[PDB]
From a paper:
The salt bridge variants exhibit similar thermostability in comparison with their parental designs but important differences in the conformational stability at 25°C can be observed such as a highly stabilizing effect for two of the proteins but a destabilizing effect to the third. Analysis of the formed geometries of the salt bridge cluster in the crystal structures show either highly ordered salt bridge clusters or only single salt bridges. Rosetta modeling of the salt bridge clusters results in a good prediction of the tendency on stability changes but not the geometries observed in the three‐dimensional structures.
Protein stability can be fine‐tuned by modifying different structural features such as hydrogen‐bond networks, salt bridges, hydrophobic cores, or disulfide bridges. Among these, stabilization by salt bridges is a major challenge in protein design and engineering since their stabilizing effects show a high dependence on the structural environment in the protein, and therefore are difficult to predict and model. In this work, we explore the effects on structure and stability of an introduced salt bridge cluster in the context of three different de novo TIM barrels. The results show that despite the similarities in protein fold, the salt bridge clusters differently influence the structural and stability properties of the de novo TIM barrel variants depending on the structural background where they are introduced.
Numbering used by the authors: 1 to 184
The structure:
């Protein structure tokens, strides 16, 4: 998720010093509120190609300087690359499929690729292949801390934690995670 709850979360996280806050939502209304409220990255959820391109253009005309497009369909991500979306968020399931998806995106000139996976094995292979942002899907506070910490001493320079619970994201802020991804 709700607008007043997302604003409240963003405000609390910013008042705790979060320097990179992402707001994820399938509703254009929430994301426009987050931009106005100062959210750093707007994460456009998986939608149709026509609706994704229309939302990207208006977020950009409204002043979004960091737009992320999330999609499991590689067609959307390329069309968002071409439109100029800033972060391409790969939500793949198969390992060898992910590095395949990442490699074409990078050859096409994607300068900011994010890989999203609850499986730490995929995220490491993404770190190996040079993905720019590792998006950890959280579930347990001590499990996320473990994954964040291993990823960090593996050399991950940009770690994002995704959670719908303010508890996990504050722990990720406390632990030094780079991007806090407010789920809605
Ligand atoms: Cl995401």
């Amino acid at each position: 998720m709700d607008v007043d709850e997302m604003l409240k979360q963003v405000e609390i996280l910013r008042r705790l010093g979060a320097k990179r806050i992402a707001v994820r939502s399938d509703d254009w209304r929430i994301l426009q509120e987050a931009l106005k409220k100062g959210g750093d990255i707007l994460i456009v959820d998986a939608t149709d190609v026509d609706e994704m391109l229309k939302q990207v253009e208006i977020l950009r005309r409204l002043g979004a300087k960091e737009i992320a497009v999330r999609s499991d369909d590689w067609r959307i991500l390329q069309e968002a690359l071409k439109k100029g979306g800033d972060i391409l968020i790969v939500d793949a399931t198969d390992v060898d499929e992910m590095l395949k998806q990442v490699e074409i995106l990078r050859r096409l000139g994607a300068k900011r690729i994010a890989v999203r996976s609850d499986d730490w094995r995929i995220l490491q292979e993404a770190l190996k292949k040079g993905g720019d942002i590792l998006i950890v899907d959280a579930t347990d506070v001590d499990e996320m801390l473990k994954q964040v910490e291993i990823l960090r001493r593996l050399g991950a320079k940009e770690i994002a934690v995704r959670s719908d619970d303010w508890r996990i994201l504050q722990e990720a802020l406390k632990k030094g995670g780079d991007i806090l991804i407010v789920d809605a």
